[PDB]
């Protein structure tokens, strides 16, 4: 790898704009994995055998 | 790995605007995993086998 | 690694605005985990086995 | 006139509920006479030769 | 007249509710008369030759 | 005019509820009558000939 006047963005998360007016919500978990906001992940690299990465709503019961 | 004048953005997260007017929530978690606000997670290397990066909203009941 | 004259940014979060005006909440947990705010992780690297990194909103009953 | 347990209303104006949201508006007006917002006029009794009464977005150039 | 146990409203105004969110207005008179706001006018008599009641808006070049 | 247990209401104004948010105005006038606000008129009686009750927004050039 070699950069000359590289003006490089990798792995990036940007300009996530969310409004929300009057907006109701009610949620009623039991053991589950209920997600309702923003999110945001940014990564580069992540290795590994059996890893996870970004796991949003995620249930494991292995 | 070498730069030269590199302005360079690597595993990054930047502008992320959230609003909200006369909103109302409600939740009742039981044992799970409720996620409802923002989340923003750079990293940039993650190594290691079987492990976990960035787990939002996440059950292991293995 | 060997940077010259290199605006880098790596592993990083920023400008995360957020407003709220009027909001009404309300949780009633019993054991889970419930995440309402904001949350701004920035790592760069992270070894290890097994290991967790940026775990929001996490229920570990192993 | 004779009232007896009388639960009388007469020349009245009640209940003018107006709800208005992201609503613009723009006049140009020149010696006329532009009438946009909530009238409630309630009278009873006017007596008189070339009176007026109740007299909105009203132009009199006699 | 003669009242004997005699709830009257007689002549009135009330209950006149008016909301506006995020309302624009602009207005550019010219000697005219430009009316934008709640009016509420509440009488019982009014007499007289010529005369005028619950002028609103009016513009009288007469 | 004879009242016995007489709970009366008679040329009144009330209960005029109002609500701005976030509204922006702007008036120009020259020589005119603008007239944005509230306004609450409550009277009983007027003689009189030529006269003028309860005038707003009135521009008189006679």
Known sequence: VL????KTKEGVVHDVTTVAEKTKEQVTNVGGAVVTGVTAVAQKTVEGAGSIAAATGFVKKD
Chains 1, 2, 3, 4, 5, 6 share one sequence.
Do not use: C, I, K, L
């Not at 950069?3 to 590289?6: A, D, F, H």
């Open 3 to 6: 950069y000359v006047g590289s």
